Design a protein around this ligand. Structure first.
Ligand SMILES: [Ca+2]
Ligand SMILES: [K+]
Ligand SMILES: [K+]
Lengths: 82, 98, 56, 98, 80
DNA sequence: CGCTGCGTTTTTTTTTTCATGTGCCGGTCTCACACGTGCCTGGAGACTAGTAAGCGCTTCTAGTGGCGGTTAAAACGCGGTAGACAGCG
DNA sequence: GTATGAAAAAAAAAATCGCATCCCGGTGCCGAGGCCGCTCAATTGGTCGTAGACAGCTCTAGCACCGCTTAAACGCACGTACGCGCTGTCTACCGCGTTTTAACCGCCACTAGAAGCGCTTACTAGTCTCCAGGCACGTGTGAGACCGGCACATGAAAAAAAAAACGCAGCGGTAC
């Protein structure tokens, strides 16, 4: 019902990420640039994940699909069934 | 009137968030995104709550990783503000793009 | 071994991920080994670049 | 006499070496280095001519690819010269050093 | 010996020129010599491990291919 | 008219308060670690058997010197110019 | 006396000049392209056995609401310190021409070690039966977060006090 959710990654949330980043000062143009890179990254992982879901004739995406996806993408996550 | 000088809170804000580990994106928003993005690949999907969380951990870790690479490029150009050009440069040298 | 000391320092009895993060990232070898490994609920080692600090 | 202005020989030296593929390190020097570095990990080793050339074909590919990244960093600093603090930034973002 | 200096200034400049580098600080030359050595050391290490495990006293192209593939620097046109 | 210094008025810099977020102590409540119990499956035992692999011997390749010769390539150095780094708005 | 006008210099666009890179053939040599007959690895065909397709059944866990509570997001406002462009100094990095060196050739002769071929043994996969390790249930007690009260080092402000442009006034000098 809200077809453009990329926005829900709110400026403050991105600021905080950037803080953990160790960033002191943030150009305004960033947020959108970030939102975009986020979108790509999620898009890429979730594609591979759903591939894995679909390959197992499941209608439900599992935590393991997301790990198999993150491992392929070279982006390996510990603590969900690794 | 009492106010802190530009980039003083910012620095506190760093120390705060570097000491902690909690996900910094409000969870519902993030979840909604993920499903919005799942539509692009298969209609009427469903997600294990742990899957949604296994993504957010991944994304948040990536972004925080980028901004560190990003932030060293800003600093490379004797700056302190991070700018799209910096991310662009970082992704470039990483291999995320041409 | 290293993470268990992490949890002392922090005055905690149980090991949480963050103790694992602080354990791994602070050891050069383990960090080479876990180079491409995200550690859920692990966060980042405190680091602030010098040029970003105020001069006084 | 006549002489070309600082840079215009370089630009050519670029065009030349991009359009070509000959290996740009002297073959025998390189090979001595390889056996120097190999004695470390085991003495009285033997190499197939090809195996040396396989290494030399990589080292050169790598260094070339590095300088490419290096150069984009130097340029990021509104410079034209490459300097060590450009290599090091590339290699950090690449993930070769800490 | 110390064959690292055998990677003359003009050869590094040659590589940089393929890299599309117009101007080259004098420091670079020794730095490059450092990064090169790391790279050779690392590849050769794993290469010679692959040799030793087959028990051969001769390092093959396939040793070096296998290494490069491990090291994330896959090579075409020497086998494998 | 022009200067010159010297009391004035402001600016810069110092010293002391001061309002702030810190991380620091010690009492309550929660649900997560740890235990435990009982059931079940997957490891162990042991013996069978068939084949992989290791060692020696057969050959012959393809790797390691080594020998000069010529040339292209490095070395080195001098000379100047444009680009790196600081400083101003 | 005054508006005026042509020299200096600056900046710029064009034509020697020469310099290095592409196209035209002609020369030759070497490596790709292709056949030869030999070897094993692909196929043919049949049987034995299991993996997985299938339809149910079970219950999980994923969805989706209700409806307070609050924290976080959002949205303004005022100002500061950072980004950014412009300049001008100096030095370091390019360009070109001596002098030095060592690589790349096309030979040499020699040996290891690679790489293949056999024969023998000890090492695995493969049956089955039998325990116990290990996991999915249900219980409980304690670490740890959470809350709120602390001094507490702090950077931001407020309160004095050691300098740089500003008046304004005294006074000397100098032509007239
Ligand atoms: Ca508190
Ligand atoms: K051989
Ligand atoms: K379910």
């Amino acid at each position: 019902v809200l077809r453009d959710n990329i926005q829900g990654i709110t400026k403050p949330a991105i600021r905080r990420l950037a803080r953990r980043g160790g960033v002191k000062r943030i150009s305004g143009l960033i947020y959108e640039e970030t939102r975009g890179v986020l979108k790509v990254f999620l898009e890429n992982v979730i594609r591979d994940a759903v591939t894995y879901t679909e390959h197992a004739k499941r209608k439900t995406v599992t935590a393991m699909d997301v790990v198999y996806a993150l491992k392929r993408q070279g982006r390996t996550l510990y603590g969900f069934g690794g | 009137p009492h106010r802190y000088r530009p980039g003083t809170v910012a620095l506190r804000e760093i120390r705060r968030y570097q000491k902690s580990t909690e996900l910094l994106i409000r969870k519902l928003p993030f979840q909604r995104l993920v499903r919005e993005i799942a539509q692009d690949f298969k209609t009427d999907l469903r997600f294990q709550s742990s899957a949604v969380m296994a993504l957010q951990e991944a994304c948040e870790a990536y972004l925080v990783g980028l901004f560190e690479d990003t932030n060293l490029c800003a600093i490379h150009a004797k700056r302190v503000t991070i700018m799209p050009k910096d991310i662009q440069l970082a992704r470039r040298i990483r291999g995320e793009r041409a | 071994e290293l993470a268990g000391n992490a949890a002392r320092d922090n005055k905690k009895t149980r090991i949480i991920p963050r103790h694992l993060q602080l354990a791994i990232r602070n050891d050069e070898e383990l960090n080479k080994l876990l180079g491409r490994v995200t550690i859920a609920q692990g966060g980042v080692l405190p680091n602030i670049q010098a040029v970003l600090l105020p001069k006084k």
